[PDB]
């Protein structure tokens with residue numbers, strides 16, 4: 029009669045990390061990749077012999093910075109002359125070239141110089157997310173919902189669809205990331221009446237606040253605000269500067285000019301930062317960090333909180349701005365939703381909860397997974413083809 033239909037997938041195509049989910053048996057499964065990771069780095073690396081995507085690309089970045097591409101989402105659908113592009117290029121070790129006022133990333137790959145459009149790099153990330161899903165489902169996947177930031181314009185949305193098409197995916201719909209996080213919590217399934225929802229999205233490099241109004245399952249974006257210069261990497265930087273100073277005090281040595289030592293320090297700082305979200309202190313243990321000196325130390329959650337105190341407080345400025353733009357008072361927000369791994373920081377949670385006079389934060393769906401979760405819920409809804417009974 030009618031053959032069983034393959035599941036459709038939800039993909040959060042993130043700036044730094046991507047995530048894939050599938051809605052089956054009345055629930056979402058966020059799919060781990062073959063290294064056991066529930067999120068995959070949005071990285072693509074090029075060598076003389078291979079094209080590596082995800083963890084394999086990020087894990088070899090230290091010695092191949094010129095040919096390992098990341099942050100293509102910051103270039104997608106933008107003109108080469110866009111001031112955002114021009115500023116971002118100064119921070120990237122890979123080459124960005126001008127092709128008819130359209131940026132392309134240029135690398136050494138399989139014996140040649142090759143340039144790729146941002147949508148081609150994103151299609152490579154989407155191919156890896158599709159393969160992650162197919163390894164779990166055990167059959168080919170065709171249909172997907174892909175998410176984008178609410179502030180993406182028509183060109184940025186079309187370039188994201190183009191990336192899905194290059195990857196061999198049928199793009200069911202491009203949906204906003206804050207909308208997908210709200211869908212993950214069923215905030216569009218609460219019946220008749222208006223609900224005001226604030227999405228608090230703190231990423232690796234950027235911070236976004238969105239205010240949505242939901243009325244009978246219909247979403248309206250009421251206000252967006254944020255800080256392009258606020259993310260998890262800024263907290264890592266504060267710990268790096270702190271430990272560089274500590275090594276100077278303790279051993280009378282400045283490590284800051286050995287890239288390997290700085291990199292090993294930063295990698296350790298990011299893990300210590302994650303431990304501090306669950307524990308009140310964390311050890312830092314690096315063997316032969318510089319001049320054969322073992323660096324065995326610790327940091328309390330209180331000291332880390334003091335180090336990033338101004339940065340954590342600054343998340344409340346875009347919250348207040350978004351509320352003024354939406355013409356709403358904080359008491360009028362019905363639901364608060366946390367998105368991004370950096371939102372696990374207890375002090376970040378406390379500052380926001382205190383701002384909203386003790387209100388509960390929706391954080392039960394892993395914040396680095398909520399967007400893919402909502403996208404998977406929507407993908408299953410979009411492929412339904414029920415014919416009405418008489």
Ligand SMILES: Nc1ncnc2c1nc(Br)n2[C@@H]1O[C@H](CO)[C@@H](O)[C@H]1O
Pocket residue numbers: 044045231232233259260261298301302303305368369370371372373396
């Ligand atoms: N448990 C956690 N506590 C604090 N931070 C975290 C945690 N988990 C993740 Br993931 N992060 C950070 O989220 C960002 C995602 O690009 C990176 O800066 C990660 O370091």
Ligand SMILES: [Mg+2]
Pocket residue numbers: 040042043205231367368399
């Ligand atoms: Mg995100």
